[PDB]
């Protein structure tokens, strides 16, 4: 029982963190086998960030312009190249702690764990979701550029995010591990605001299912709804439109609880229209949208508390 | 700038988790140097255990009775004993991944990270607090017994909790690493239940200081209060009584912000009596109580772990 915003154990990622410095700029890098990945803006001074031309800035660097350190130990750079917004540095030694891994680009609304680091040293791990507008909703730790986001399946680490920039509203922007930004953001220190954001409907429904599996049914009702009528209501509350695909993804949770998906949608519609009347669900006074259906299945019992 | 709920990097603890099996009962154990620590109820019946006689049951147990597995390696048990509600199994191999560590007994209100584990394999990590009623609102499923809670200072892991039981309300109970339960709970099936709980005043105050440090300061006012008058109000809202010792613990945050603790208490009184009137504090609509003064100091000062 219980339900928490839990992250994946971070050990496999801890053993890959390093520090990368170019000039007076230092940030975190990810060391896998014989390569170190980091934001290309490490080659930029705050000044450069106003209107940088990375091709021109990088051609002026040599392998020895980069100092990579694992702890207090320097790793010699023997090659370098830029891949989109990432710098790939080949080093002369391999990381024996490299886990089995994959690079994946996640979709908005999906969740991942972030190992926040400073100067190549881990400070903490937290769980978050890629917002529909491609930003991450929490507050990052100072100097966390280069810290990465990941999910773990069995013993394979799927890296999906590298932190690059800080946004005006205080939200954060970054890229996947091929160096492509999530969202309409670029690595230039200029005002760029996030598009409008929405509540992740699929996740809110997943979470209501978690509450039922854990024994609570107070918010259910005797009504049902069509997908269309649900969207007509939910979209008035800034919720992402719900699609049949989303409905299909909720199949397993629906089968485990005996509550048809559209019946749970009728419950959510009422919660949006009438509020929670001072009550809580899974300890929260507001509807939570940072747990995917997969997160709920992984954390909750496969046996509903009837 | 930067502040959110985080767990400590779990790598150092992941390297200490093992699976301990006695017949049909399998749970988790903590492997440090040549000793494996685990809940003594690992030696109990099949899916139940009403009033077991532990000292008697241990007699009919040989070292060979205990199957300990670290990853895919069997660890040969060469000794066993009981220490309060824990079993200490001596194994023939000292854990190569043993971190610098200490065993500490935390106090109510204090926080720690929990590494949820099943079959000796780490599954997730989250931050939680020891509730004033000596239970933790964790997230645990069958097979999680033996999972541990800890804090990390520099490179030293302070273990403070080992998981043993789930109570009727879905909250959790366990012991320190000397095998002594937190609270009046016992490792047997009884009618034991969690007592009433209170909000952790000290932590709510620490969080308001975190808010101020991060620029969220609309709730501050020009007044103050006596401790007694604050408690008269807080207690009506089911907040733990604030003591002079708690006021002292907040000294570092009060000094950093220049806001006297009793002045912050006056701000909190106003929040409890009038609510937020729509506004938010660090993005929250409610007052958070699972960040200690130390968590705030560590996070807002940028500490990392080696």
Q: A300 near A208, Cβ under 8 Å?
A: no
- Selecting from B285, B302, B304 the residue whose C-beta is nearest the C-beta of A286 gives B285
Q: Are the Cβ atoms of A9 and B299 closer than 8 angstroms?
A: no
DSSP B40-79: GGGG--SS--SS--HHHHHHT--GGGEEEEETTEEE-EEE
CATH topology of domain B1-14+100-197: Thrombin, subunit H (2.40.10)
Catalytic residue among B145, B160, B163, B172: B145
Cross-strand partners of B247:
none
Q: Are the Cβ atoms of A4 and B128 closer than 8 angstroms?
A: yes
Angle CA A173–B4–B235, to nearest 5:
150
Which tokens in the block code for residue A169?
Answer: 């509203």
Q: Are the Cβ atoms of A4 and B299 closer than 8 angstroms?
A: no
Going from N- to C-terminal start, the domains of chain A cover 1-14+100-197, 15-99, 198-301
Tell me the backbone φ, ψ of residue A276, rounded to 5 degrees.
Answer: -95, 5
List the single residue in B with minimal CA-CA distance to A151.
Answer: B124
Which of A1, A142, A153, A291 to mutate against chain B (most B CBs within 10 Å)? A1
Q: Which of B203, B196, B177 is nearest to B111 (CA)?
A: B203
CATH architecture of A15-99: Beta Barrel (2.40)
Which tokens in the block code for residue B149?
Answer: 């809670």
Fold agreement (B1-14+100-197, B15-99): yes
Catalytic residue among A16, A38, A41, A80: A41
- Selecting from A7, A115, A215 the residue whose C-beta is nearest the C-beta of B124 gives A7
**What does the longest C-alpha to C-alpha distance in chain A come to?**
69
* Strand boundaries in B84-146, DSSP class E: 86-91, 100-103, 111-118, 121-129
Catalytic residue among A16, A38, A117, A145: A145
CATH topology of domain A198-301: main proteinase (3clpro) structure, domain 3 (1.10.1840)
Q: Are the Cβ atoms of A126 and B285 closer than 8 angstroms?
A: no
Q: How many CB atoms lie within 10 A of CB B77?
A: 19
Which of B3, B5, B6, B170 to mutate against chain A (most A CBs within 10 Å)? B6
Tell me the backbone φ, ψ of residue A39, rounded to 5 degrees.
Answer: -60, 135
Q: Which of A89, A22, A29, A88 is nearest to A61 (CA)?
A: A22
Report the alpha-carbon distance of residue A284 to residue A273 in Å, rounded.
Answer: 18
Which tokens in the block code for residue B114?
Answer: 């929990």
Q: Which of B35, B15, B19, B36 is nearest to B27 (CA)?
A: B19
**Helix H segments across chain A?**
11-14, 54-59, 201-213, 227-234, 244-249, 251-257, 261-274, 293-299
Any residues with CB less than 8 A from the CB of A284 and at least 6 apart, and which?
none
Report the alpha-carbon distance of residue B241 to residue B231 in Å, rounded.
Answer: 6
Tokens 């701000």 map to which residue? B267
Based on its alpha-carbon atoms, the radius of gyration of chain A, rounded to whole angstroms, reads 22
Q: How far is CA A259 from CA A59, A252, A264, A269, B168, in A?
A: 60, 11, 7, 15, 25
- Residues of chain B neighbouring A5 (CB-CB closer than 8 A): 5, 126
- Residues of chain B neighbouring A118 (CB-CB closer than 8 A): 302, 304
Whether A134 is catalytic:
no
Q: How far is CA B72 from CA B18, B64, B75, B120, B121, in A?
A: 10, 18, 10, 10, 11
Q: How far is CA B290 from CA A56, B20, B259, B287, B295, in A?
A: 49, 32, 21, 10, 9
Which of B1, B3, B8, B9 to mutate against chain A (most A CBs within 10 Å)? B9
Q: A219 near A291, Cβ under 8 Å?
A: no
The 10 Å CB-count burial string (b at 16+, else e) for A275-301 is eeeeeebbeeeebbbbbbbebbbebbe
List the single residue in A with minimal CA-CA distance to B167.
Answer: A1
A·B CB contacts under 8 A: 118
- For A229, which DSSP code? H
Report the alpha-carbon distance of residue A92 to residue A34 in Å, rounded.
Answer: 7
Q: A226 near A262, Cβ under 8 Å?
A: yes
Helix (H) or strand (E) holding A21: strand A17-22
Report the alpha-carbon distance of residue B63 to residue A278 in Å, rounded.
Answer: 55
Report the alpha-carbon distance of residue A176 to residue A85 in Å, rounded.
Answer: 9
CA contacts within 13 A on the Cβ side of B90: 5
Method: X-ray
Q: Which of A166, A135, A159, A127 is nearest to A288 (CA)?
A: A127
Report the alpha-carbon distance of residue A29 to residue A18 in Å, rounded.
Answer: 5
A134: left (phi over 0), alpha (psi -120 to 50) or beta: left
- Let me know how long chain A is: 306
Any residues with CB less than 8 A from the CB of B12 and at least 6 apart, and which?
A11, B97, B99, B152, B157
Q: B237 near B275, Cβ under 8 Å?
A: no
Q: Looking at beta carbons, which pairs linking B226-230 to residues 24 or more positions away fall under 8 Å? A: B226/B262, B227/B262, B227/B265, B229/B269, B230/B262, B230/B265, B230/B266, B230/B268, B230/B269
Which tokens in the block code for residue A87?
Answer: 């710098």
Q: How many CB atoms lie within 10 A of CB A90?
A: 15
Q: How many CB atoms lie within 10 A of CB A68?
A: 21
Tell me the backbone φ, ψ of residue B204, rounded to 5 degrees.
Answer: -60, -45
- Residues of chain A neighbouring B286 (CB-CB closer than 8 A): 285
- Residues of chain A neighbouring B5 (CB-CB closer than 8 A): 5, 126
CA A69 to chain centroid, in Å, comes to: 26
DSSP B240-297: PPP-HHHHHHTHHHHHHHT--HHHHHHHHHHHHHH--TT--BTTBSS---S--HHHHH
Any residues with CB less than 8 A from the CB of A112 and at least 6 apart, and which?
A106, A127, A128, A129, A130, A149, A150, A151, A160, A161
Q: B296 near B210, Cβ under 8 Å?
A: yes
Q: Which of A4, A105, A302 is nearest to B126 (CA)?
A: A4
Compute the nearest-CA separation of A11 from chain B (Å). 4
Q: How far is CA B140 from CA B16, B167, B262, in A?
A: 19, 11, 38
Cross-strand partners of B174:
B163
Q: A16 near A95, Cβ under 8 Å?
A: yes
Q: B20 near B28, Cβ under 8 Å?
A: yes
Helix, strand, coil shares, percent, chain B, to 5: 25, 30, 45
User: What SS3 class is residue A158?
Assistant: strand
Report the alpha-carbon distance of residue A147 to residue A276 in Å, rounded.
Answer: 37
Q: Which of B303, B199, B296 is nearest to B257 (CA)?
A: B296
Interface of B with A (CB under 8 A): 1-12, 14-15, 115-116, 122-126, 128, 137-142, 166, 170-172, 214, 282, 285-286, 299, 302-306
Query: Strand A100-103 to strand B86-91: parallel, antiparallel, or no bridges (unpaired)?
Result: unpaired
DSSP B189-205: --S-------B-HHHHH
């Amino acid at each position: 029982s219980g339900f928490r915003k839990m992250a994946f154990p971070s050990g496999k990622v801890e053993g890959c963190m390093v520090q990368v410095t170019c000039g007076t700029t230092t940030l975190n890098g990810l060391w896998l086998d014989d390569t170190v990945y980091c934001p290309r803006h490490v080659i930029c001074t705050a000044e450069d960030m106003l209107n940088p031309n990375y091709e021109d800035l990088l051609i002026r660097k040599s392998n020895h312009s980069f100092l990579v350190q694992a702890g207090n130990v320097q790793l010699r750079v023997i090659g370098h190249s830029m891949q989109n917004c990432l710098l790939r540095l080949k080093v002369d030694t391999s990381n024996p702690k490299t886990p089995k891994y994959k690079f994946v680009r996640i979709q908005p609304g999906q969740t991942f764990s972030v190992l926040a680091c400073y100067n190549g040293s881990p400070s903490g791990v937290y769980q978050c979701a890629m917002r529909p507008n491609h930003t991450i909703k929490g507050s990052f730790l100072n100097g966390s550029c280069g810290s990465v986001g990941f999910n773990i399946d069995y013993d394979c680490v799927s890296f999906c995010y590298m932190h690059h920039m800080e946004l005006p509203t205080g939200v954060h922007a970054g890229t996947d591990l091929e160096g492509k930004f999530y969202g309409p953001f670029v690595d230039r220190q200029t005002a760029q605001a996030a598009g409008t954001d929405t509540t992740i409907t699929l996740n809110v429904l997943a979470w209501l299912y978690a509450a039922v599996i854990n024994g609570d049914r107070w918010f259910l009702n005797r009504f049902t709804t069509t997908l269309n009528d649900f969207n007509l209501v939910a979209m008035k509350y800034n919720y992402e439109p719900l699609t049949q695909d989303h409905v299909d993804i909720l199949g397993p949770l629906s089968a485990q609880t005996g509550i048809a998906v559209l019946d749970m949608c009728a419950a959510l519609k009422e919660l949006l229209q009438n509020g929670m009347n001072g009550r809580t669900i899974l300890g929260s006074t507001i509807l939570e949208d940072e747990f995917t259906p997969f997160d709920v299945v992984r954390q909750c019992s496969g046996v509903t508390f009837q």
